């Protein structure tokens, strides 16, 4: 029979496991956190070799039944390295139905990230993929090159370096396009992605309305205030509104 294996983030691998008990076969799927959008096809040991975009229409005796989307929407396990993606311009189909990039409502923030649709709290909205570099590197260079750096764990930083900060040059993920707020409606949270691998995602903390801008706390060290000058500014301002 069927096995589902959930990641802590709510995504899952589902399928009949093989003789040796591995997520291996032609009819395995990764199902996104909405429990509707899925990537269906060939996996070996839980790695997506060839996943075709599908909708989960229902389950019978716990067995998922998918409808393929028209096209040849194929996706592949593609962990970044110097290389952000093998398909810089191929969007995440789950992300694409949920967010879009537009001018930010925050004065001189530039661009920002918005909900296409109204969602609940705890809803994963967008992915933060990037190149995978080291803290020493990140911390050895000027802030001007550190606009999109995001701490993944204690060995790894995730970056979206110029010119991938432009959507016409990179749009496989959009998490980096979310602006900072000290009164955020989202957080960065761990996510295990079938294409990007282990990255971070952007998740709502509260219900959000269609066309609201999504914001997160960048969470730079307040006292080592090691941050760019615009953040140091918004911090003085905010703490005044607080103290």
């Amino acid at each position: 029979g069927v096995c589902w294996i959930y990641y802590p983030d709510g995504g899952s691998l589902v399928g009949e496991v093989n003789e040796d008990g591995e997520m291996t076969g032609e009819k395995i799927a990764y199902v996104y956190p909405d429990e509707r959008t899925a990537l269906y096809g060939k996996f070996i040991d839980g790695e997506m070799i060839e996943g075709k975009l599908a909708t989960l229409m229902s389950t019978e005796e716990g067995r998922p039944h998918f409808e393929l989307m028209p096209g040849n929407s194929v996706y592949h396990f593609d962990k970044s390295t110097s290389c952000i993606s093998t398909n810089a311009l191929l969007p995440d189909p789950y992300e694409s139905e949920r967010v879009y990039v537009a001018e930010s409502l925050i004065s001189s923030a530039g661009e920002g990230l918005f909900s296409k649709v109204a969602v609940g709290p705890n809803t994963v909205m967008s992915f933060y993929n990037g190149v995978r570099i080291t803290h020493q590197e990140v911390d050895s260079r000027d802030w001007a090159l550190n606009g999109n750096t995001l701490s993944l764990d204690e060995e790894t930083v995730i970056d979206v370096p110029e010119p991938y900060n432009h959507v016409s040059k990179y749009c496989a993920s959009l998490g980096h396009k979310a602006n900072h707020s000290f009164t955020p409606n989202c957080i960065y949270d761990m996510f295990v992605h079938p294409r990007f691998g282990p990255i971070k995602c952007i998740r709502t903390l509260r219900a959000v309305e269609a066309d609201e801008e999504l914001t997160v706390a960048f969470g730079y060290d307040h006292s080592p205030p090691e941050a760019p000058e615009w953040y140091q500014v918004e911090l003085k301002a905010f703490q005044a509104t607080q103290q």
Binding site: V138, D139, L150
Partner: peptide
């Protein structure tokens, strides 16, 4: 140090 969300 110089990156989001450490």
């Amino acid at each position: 140090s110089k990156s989001k969300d450490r």
